[model samples]
Target: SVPSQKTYQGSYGFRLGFLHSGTAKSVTCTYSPALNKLFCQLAKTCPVQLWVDSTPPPGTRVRAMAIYKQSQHMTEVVRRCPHHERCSDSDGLAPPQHLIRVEGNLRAEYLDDRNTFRHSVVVPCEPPEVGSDCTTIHYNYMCYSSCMGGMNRRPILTIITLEDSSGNLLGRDSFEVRVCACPGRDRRTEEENLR
Candidate 1:
C-alpha cells in the first residue's frame, strides 16, 4: 500500500499583464494513463474584446493540444504558444521534475483584473529512486498585488503527462529529475516570535 502521509511543498498564484485579464475559478489538474495526455481545466470568464493565452512557456517540450475549454463547452483560442525556444535543459523552464503548479493571471469568479495571483503548487510526481511510497505533493506561495480588483479570484488548470518516446506512460521509475521551488519562507514578525 502507498504511504499514509505524502508531504509536497509548493505555492499557488497567477500572472497578469496588459494582454490578458481574468481569473481562474477552479483548477482540475490530472494525469491520464489511457489518454496519454495531461488535462487542465481553467474555469474562467473573459470580456468580449480580450483573449487568454493558455500555452506553456516558450522552448518547452509539448506534444499537442489534446483539448481546451472556456467553460462547460470546449472551444479553441487563436493564440498558440510560440515554440521558437525549447529549453536545452528541463531545469531552465520546466518545473523541475515532480513539482507542478496550476496558476494564471486572474482570480476566482472572474471579477477584478487589477492584481496578479501567482502561486507554486507541488505535484505528486516523484521519481523511481524515491519510489512510489510518496502519495501527496506539498506547495506554498506568496500573494501579492497592487490594486484591489475583483478579477483576481479566478483559478487556472495545469496538467503534466509522463510518457516515453512512443507515447507510453512512464512509471515513477522513468522520471529523469525532480523540480522544487525554493522561495524563502515569508514569515511575519508575529509568526517569527513562535520560533
Candidate 2:
C-alpha cells in the first residue's frame, strides 16, 4: 500500500515474523540486495508459497492489492509497501529536494573551476518522496554535484535532505555558497581587524 500521510520518525524499527499459511509449513522473510526486492521464504512443509510477482519502485503510490508473489494454488497480495525517509539534514545543509530519476548512461562533469570557484553537475539516485523520513539516510540521494573552473582556492560543500512526518521528502534544498580563505583575503582581514 502507498504510505498515507503519516508522521514517520525516520527509522521505524521493523521486526521479522515467521508464519504458517494453509498448506505452507512456514514462511520467513528475506531481502534481496541485487534486485532490491523483499519476499518470504516458504518452507516445503507449508502448503502456500509467497513471493513478489510484480515489483514497484520505491516511490510508487500503491492503493489496491498488487500481486506481489504467485504460486500455482495461491497468490500473495501486497499487504504493505516499504517506507523510506528522505536524505535530509546532512552535515549543516538544510536538505535536498531534487533527484535524478532517469536511468542509463549517466555521468558527472566539472563545468569550471577557478582558484576559489568550482561548479559541476552530477546524476543522483531517485529523489526521496515528499516529506519522507531521512534521519538515517545518506546525503548521496540528494544529488550529484560538480564544480566549475579551476581555482587555487579551496572551498567546502555540504548536502542534506529533508522530509515530513510520514517520512515523505520535503523540498528544502540548500547550499553553502561561500568563497575560500585565500592568501590575499587573509591579509585583508588582518589589516581590517588592526583598525
Candidate 3:
C-alpha cells in the first residue's frame, strides 16, 4: 500500500509556508539577495519541502499623460511707436504687437495605468516662482507659419502640476495652441471707397 498524502499550511508575518508528508527528513530555509528571505518549520511525523518565491514590492513610477488645451487668448501687447512721420505711412501694416496667450490643463498617470489627477493648480507664465511640491518653468520664442505669417502662428504651451496629497512630482504636459486670427476685411478702405 502507498503512504497516505497529507498537506499543511502556515503563515508567519510576511512569509508563507506549505508542508507535505513523506519521511523523517528535515527541510532547510535559505535567503537570497534577489529573492529576499525564506524559512520553514518541520515536524518528525511529516517531511516537507518549502521554498519562497520572493518578489520586491512595487516602486513608484509615475508619468505625464495626455495634455489638453483648455482655452487661450491674446492677453496684452507692448507697442513701440516709430520715431518719424514716414513711419505713420508704414503703419498701415505694423509689426505684430500682440502678446500671445495660451492656457491648458495637465494630466498625470500613476503606475502606468490609472485615473489621472487633475485638481492641482498651475503657476502663471510670467514671473516664474518655485516652491516645495511646485513646478516652475520658463518659455520663449514662437513659430509662425509662412503661409499665414505671424497672424496664424500656432505655438505649443507646456503645463505642469504636482500631486496635492503626497506632494510628489506628478508630471508635465504640452499642447498646441489652436487660436486663429479674426475674420474681416479692411473696414477703413471699404468705408472710404463706399463714400
Candidate 4:
C-alpha cells in the first residue's frame, strides 16, 4: 500500500456518492468558474440520494451522517414546528416512521454484459428528509435571517460527513445547493435586484 499526504487518510479510504430521485424535477447543477466548485439547485421541494462505496477490503459500515455550513452561516433552518418530536409523532402517516424506502442497484462495470456486473451492491439511497414546516436562507440581498419576506435563494455549502460504527469520520462531501423561491431568473437581474 502506498501512502500519501494529499490522499484521504483512513483505515480504508471511502468514496461517497450523491444523486436525486424523481421528485427533484426542475433541479440543475453547474460548476463555479471561480473555484470549480459544484452547485446544485431546485425550487423548495427537492430531495437527494447519498451513499458510500467501498470494495475489496470492504467494510463500509456507515453509521451516521451530518450537514454543516462550514462557516457561521444559517444553512439549515427548521421553522414553525417548534415541538419537533411531538409534531413528528402526530404528523402524517399511521406509523409516522413508515416512509417510502428507496433501494438502488449499482454496478461497477458495463463491459462484459449488461446484466453481469464486476461489482454489484444494493444501495439504500437517502433523500433529503425535512419536516413539514415553514422556513428561510442567504448569500446579500440574499437572505438567511429574513426567512419570510420575498424569499431569495442563496447558494450555500452543504457539507456532509460519513461516519463509522464507533462514530469515526470516514469521508466528507461538500457542495453548494440552494432552495429558491425565485424561478430560474437571470443572474444579472437577480444581482441587480439584490443590490
> Best candidate per TM-score, number?
4
Per-residue error for 193 in candidate 2, Å, reads: 9.6
Q: Lowest summed lDDT over 10 consecutive residues: which window, candidate 4?
A: 134-143
- Model 2, 48-105: lDDT tens digits are 1111223223442111111212232122211111111142432332212222111121
How does each model score on lDDT?
0.21, 0.23, 0.23, 0.29
Q: TM-score of model 3 relative to the true fold?
A: 0.17
lDDT score, residue 11, model 3? 23
For each of the candidates, give the backbone clash count: 41, 52, 0, 3
Q: lDDT order of candidates, best first? A: 4, 2, 3, 1
Tens digit per residue, CA lDDT, model 1, 1-195: 111111111121112112121222332222222222222232111111111123222222211111122243123211112221122222223232112322331211111112322212222222223542212221211111110121122222222232233433322111111111211121122124545
CA displacement after TM-score superposition, residue 127 of candidate 3 (Å): 23
- The number of the candidate with the highest lDDT is 4
Residue-by-residue lDDT tens digits, candidate 4, 1-195: 111112232543443333322222343433332331333342122233343233212333331111223333243321212222233542221222111111221321111113321111112223223761211111111123123421223233443334453434565554444333332333223334656
Give a tens-digit lDDT track for model 3, residues 13-104: 11112233221223322212122111212111111112212221223221211222223522211111122212332212222221221122
TM-score of each: 0.20, 0.16, 0.17, 0.36
- Cα lDDT over the full model 4: 0.29
User: Which sections of candidate 1 miss by over 4 Å?
Assistant: 1-126, 130-132, 135-154, 168-195
Clashing pairs in 4: 137-143, 137-144, 138-143
